[PDB]
Amino acid sequence: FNATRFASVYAWNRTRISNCVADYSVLYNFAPFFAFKCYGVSPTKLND
């Protein structure tokens, strides 16, 4: 989330996230979202 040189769409820089506990409040507090739509999981249900 706190990158400075996000790669362009023609590269779509993807990162592998493993061996950590995914807390979504750190994701929330960094970005004042404009599109937080979800398809497979509920936005409210991510910490469980």
Ligand X SMILES: *[C@@H]1O[C@H](CO)[C@@H](O)[C@H](O)[C@H]1NC(C)=O
Residues that bind ligand X (CB under 6 A): 1-2, 30-31
State the amino acid at position 34 in one-letter form. F
Q: How would DSSP label each residue in 21-38?
A: ---SHHHHHH---S----
Taking the least distance from each CB to other proteins, the nearer of 7 and 38 is: 38
Taking the least distance from each CB to other proteins, the nearer of 6 and 28 is: 28
Residue 36, contacted partner among ligand X, other proteins, none, CB below 5-8 A by kind: other proteins
Closest alpha carbon to 3 in 11, 21, 15, 16: 15
Q: Which of 5, 14, 16, 37 binds other proteins (CB under 8 A)?
A: 37
